[PDB]
Paper text:
The astacins are a family of metallopeptidases that share a central ∼200-residue catalytic domain (CD), which is found in >1000 species across holozoans and, sporadically, bacteria. Here, we crystallized the zymogen of the long paralogue, hereafter referred to as pLAST-[name], and solved its crystal structure.
The primary activation site of pLAST (K48–N49) is inserted within short helix α2 and buried in the zymogen, thus preventing access by activating enzymes in a similar fashion as found in pro-astacin. Next, N49 would bind the ‘family-specific residue’ immediately after the third zinc-binding histidine (E150; Bode et al., 1993; Gomis-Rüth, 2003), which in turn is held in place by internal salt bridges with R237 and R153 in the zymogen.
Numbering used by the authors: 22 to 403
Amino acid sequence: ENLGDLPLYHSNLFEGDIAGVSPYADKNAIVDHTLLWPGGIVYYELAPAAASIRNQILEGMKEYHEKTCIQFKERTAGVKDYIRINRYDGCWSMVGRQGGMQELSLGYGCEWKGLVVHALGHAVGFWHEQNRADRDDYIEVIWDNILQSMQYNFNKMEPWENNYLNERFDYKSVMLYGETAFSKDGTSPTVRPKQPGVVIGPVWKKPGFSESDVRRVNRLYECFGEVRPPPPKIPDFICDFESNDCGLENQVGMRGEFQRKYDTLGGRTGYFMVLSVTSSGTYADSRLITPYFGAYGNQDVCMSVDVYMSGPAVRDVEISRQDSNTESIGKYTEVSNSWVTRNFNLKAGREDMRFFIFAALDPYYGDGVVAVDNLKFKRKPC
Ligand SMILES: [Mg+2]
Ligand SMILES: [Zn+2]
């Protein structure tokens, strides 16, 4: 019944099994100075004495893996902070990460899942449930049934554990000593539960975490499920030319120069790309090279462009989509003598698209204008 917990109560150790703490230490101060494992990644190694019980060690660890975001990894090259597990006298551990090698003992009698999960509980950050600031609301300490050299092991924390307790006093906590801990004669109780009918019982028979233990671990280590919000829509492009070039450049060795121009043409009065010739002038051809646009997702795009063509000098206006090979999508030989929104629906392999706007003007036949406006790029079927 209660003799299974005897390797938990060492004489020269803080609260029986807390190593690296001074037996009569301020309990508020040592808790505040507790360090946690970055990322919930606890590195470890087994001493040769601890190898003989490796299955029972991996059993307690299996408890953290299955319910929390704590990962027990074997120590590899470059790791400096880790737990060396050995078999000393009884079960015990340092509370939190110490920095450098730290010891955990899993002695004779410490094979039980309860004691493995208990000692590993100290290792990752947790203290004793019986000494919480509010424990006296839930348990009575029969000071007269405790050994006089052992009484500090029951001193509770003073309130002011900033933003209060958080998880409620849990009687099924694997971090809670059973009724006969530190008993003077072994059977007389040192702790009495105030809640009618309740018995804490020993730790070695507890199968791992209770529901409240899991909450504490997941809260300390920010373990969670709350899914991040969905990503914003891909912003559809729309050029105006009213304050910029938009990135659309010209080919070098050409006869015409497509220039960013403010004027009036066929109803509208604003900024549009204009290529124009006079009867007196010379042959002008120009290739407006549009910037490179990504599709981001496996979807059929759509490109819009308002095209203006006027004058007998307009010989030909060609729009082409280039990806890995240049493909012609539109060829306009007839002069519309108006603005016409050209709508090209296109498919996407997996590479960025740029567009070409070619225009040829021969002043031999008369005057001519080729204007370009409202250049849009939507990643959805036209
Ligand atoms: Mg002790
Ligand atoms: Zn303990």
